[PDB]
Amino acid sequence: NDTSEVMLLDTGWEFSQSGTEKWMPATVPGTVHQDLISHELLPNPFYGMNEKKIQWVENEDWEYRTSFIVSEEQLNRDGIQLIFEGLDTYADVYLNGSLLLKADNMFVGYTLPVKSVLRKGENHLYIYFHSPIRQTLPQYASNGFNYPADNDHHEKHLSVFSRKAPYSYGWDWGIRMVTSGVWRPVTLRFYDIATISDYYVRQLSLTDENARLSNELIVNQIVPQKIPAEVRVNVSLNGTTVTEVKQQVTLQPGINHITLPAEVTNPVRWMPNGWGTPTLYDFSAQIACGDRIVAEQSHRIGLRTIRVVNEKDKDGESFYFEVNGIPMFAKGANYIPQDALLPNVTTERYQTLFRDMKEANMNMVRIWGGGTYENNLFYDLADENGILVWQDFMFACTPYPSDPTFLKRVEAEAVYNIRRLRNHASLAMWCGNNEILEALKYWGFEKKFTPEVYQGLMHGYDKLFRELLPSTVKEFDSDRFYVHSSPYLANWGRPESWGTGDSHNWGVWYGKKPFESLDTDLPRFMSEFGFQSFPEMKTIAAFAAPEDYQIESEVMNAHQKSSIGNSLIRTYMERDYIIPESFEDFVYVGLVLQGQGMRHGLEAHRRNRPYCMGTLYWQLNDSWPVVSWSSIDYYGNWKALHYQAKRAFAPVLINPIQQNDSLSVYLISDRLDTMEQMTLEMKVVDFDGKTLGKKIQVHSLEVPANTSKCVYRAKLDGWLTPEDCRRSFLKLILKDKSGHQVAESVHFFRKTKDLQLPPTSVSYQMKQTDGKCELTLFSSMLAKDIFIETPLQGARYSDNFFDLLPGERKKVIITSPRIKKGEELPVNIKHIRETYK
Ligand SMILES: [Br-]
Ligand SMILES: [Br-]
Ligand SMILES: [Br-]
Ligand SMILES: [Br-]
Ligand SMILES: [Br-]
Ligand SMILES: [Br-]
Ligand SMILES: [Br-]
Ligand SMILES: [Cl-]
Ligand SMILES: [Cl-]
Ligand SMILES: [Cl-]
Ligand SMILES: [Cl-]
Ligand SMILES: [Cl-]
Ligand SMILES: [Cl-]
């Protein structure tokens, strides 16, 4: 609500491969690749072997153009700014014969004063995008060594020279699409007197009784006179004013700094997912000049404390988050770009992914440093879903340059994004990079370079990650934690270091260690651990013809970038499952495997609180159709791992853990309230539905807030025979004093491959309407790890990848806007015994 007028330059753009004099319609925001696809000038880059066929684009320059009209009335506004929220990457901006800007950083928004260049009538904007490959060949040639960036899929590692999304050059789950273009919106704003260049709501203090805020405004006045104004900040909640403050000023030409204190008595705090409401106040700053509101800016603000506790202690060095005074065990995942082509990621897709996180009970997401600083919508959704955000700076897995020019470019992206993000309730901490010091010290790299260059890399590390970035956080976001790297010291190979900070476990997967190692190999905080899976068949069909379905085939090694890939999946599967003959059935067990194995680790982490205070698995999501460590595939389909993470992160969890022919049962709660007079009930049930022995009852159980506690141990010997352990399972239920159920769990006493699973039909009734299909499933005998498979991309399930227990009916709701009444939903139910003879 101000007097400015904004024109979106988001239609009527054209592009041209440089020097062909051929122009065609473009979509802006967008990418060169998508503009080509859309005129059938590229094949589907995700389909089959098209990866090799699309690389040529990275070697060309690309130009974009648009025309707009400006009226005499508009040209008579005091000020007119052209805003680029993003240019990828080396971009020459020309308006009406003027070079406005030589852009050189994908991660920076540019605000350009243009009134003096604009013309009544037609106006011509041209943007020239230099190939970031050809732009940096001479830079590389001058360097006289290749930076060891193995995820840059090219002999010459040119990524490290450019402030560009690292993953664009490739990665061990990624396609190489080194694209260009106007990747975020272009707006022209026509205004009077000034704009608000920045609005920071700085929390000075927070108690139950009062919140103290400093409203800090930078106002850019574009007229040459002194202008009396009143600054106003309105604090509102759900449309109702809570407090109003104002301040007389006389704005000077150029930058003005304005500071207004405001207080909220009896503040309603922002809570993370699980602990209550993620309450957001509306803070609105207005600049009023007489009758007219010349500038306004708002932020949604959450009133909370977040402290990162990173202190020497008996165990080494703690690493945990205290939210509103309470240690909060972190439960979430590492997030990567949702697409090879970032502007194709829509509002719906961002909303669905946060629905996926919130429904799996997560309270944290790490924006890993080989992606982007996410758009404003991402942080807004993290705010309104109660997800803490761990923000890496966009450096990952290689040393980077540290020359003055390079540092100046990084300082600019750090100041831009810190100011862009520092008003979000969700933002919890900054991290300098992903695994750069680990890589410098341990991946070797030392053996690859002269000592001279090595020493240059080591001092270069300090200049960027221990000086420039920490000092910048201290200046612009002084109450947020910064750490130079994840992991900061813990090395997976060095068990003595595990008590010290966050860990990236590479024992599971790279080191081939069994999932069971995660019960003994305990970190203070798991920032990264993971396991691959092939995605389900409807997702393979999207990139592969039926001809092409094989475990180490051509396209199934092309769709794996890790190279050890498909082999590790078979090696791990054989330990716990019978390997099926059919590709389809192997795909299904592979989803089950990744699910069970990772859930086991996620449970170990919560079980070992307080020693361990969080787990973020690698990885939530995918950028394209591919074999990856994801829990959600590129089309939004939940793998078994997503259902399993949800189960393992449930606020109260019954965790039966069997080691050394003994069972222990823990009760784990992340609730803020302590539960009293609880009963654990267990009974041993055979795969036919017959109870073995008596129900076991443990009464008088306290479940204190934010603890893991053991409530029952029993040696297996004398309780069940080896034959029994292959033939039955443990059913566990937790109930309050009044016998109402608050949690259940199922426990198997042997590896699935060692189970005597009876042959069985899962039968179902199906009630199908618009958008919806309600299945009632039944099997008189145990059906293990059932997978209700439909060919409908993106279908959501109330539940899936669960055991259907003997005799016990189970309701499952499947939903999709594409479910039409009368076209019966194709449904194929798989279970483990079905996969071998
Ligand atoms: Br201007
Ligand atoms: Br400006
Ligand atoms: Br000032
Ligand atoms: Br955006
Ligand atoms: Br060298
Ligand atoms: Br530091
Ligand atoms: Br055992
Ligand atoms: Cl504070
Ligand atoms: Cl005043
Ligand atoms: Cl040397
Ligand atoms: Cl609960
Ligand atoms: Cl176990
Ligand atoms: Cl329940």
Author numbering: 28 to 864
The authors write:
No significant inhibition of BtMan2A could be detected following incubation with 1 or 2, but the enzyme was 85% inhibited by 3, again indicating performance enhancement attributable to the N-octylazido linker. The electron density for several aromatic residues lining the entrance to the active site pocket, notably W470, W533, and Y537 were extremely diffuse, hindering modelling and suggesting a high degree of mobility in the complex. The alkyl linker extends into a channel lined with these diffuse aromatic residues, possibly giving rise to similar, albeit more dynamic, hydrophobic interactions to those observed in the CmMan5A active site. Comparisons of the labelled enzyme structure to the previously determined structures of complexes with 2,4-dinitrophenyl 2-deoxy-2-fluoro-β-d-mannoside (2FMan, non-covalent/pre-catalytic) and noeuromycin, show that the ligand has migrated significantly away from the expected position of the GEI (ESI Fig. 3†). Reorientation of the catalytic nucleophile breaks the hydrogen bond with O2, allowing relaxation of the ring conformation. This makes space for a water molecule to interact with R393. Due to the interaction of these aromatic rings with the alkyl linker, we hypothesized that hydrophobic interactions related to the presence of the octyl linker drive this active site rearrangement. We thus conclude that there exists a more fundamental instability in the GEI structure of BtMan2A, possibly explaining earlier failures to trap it.
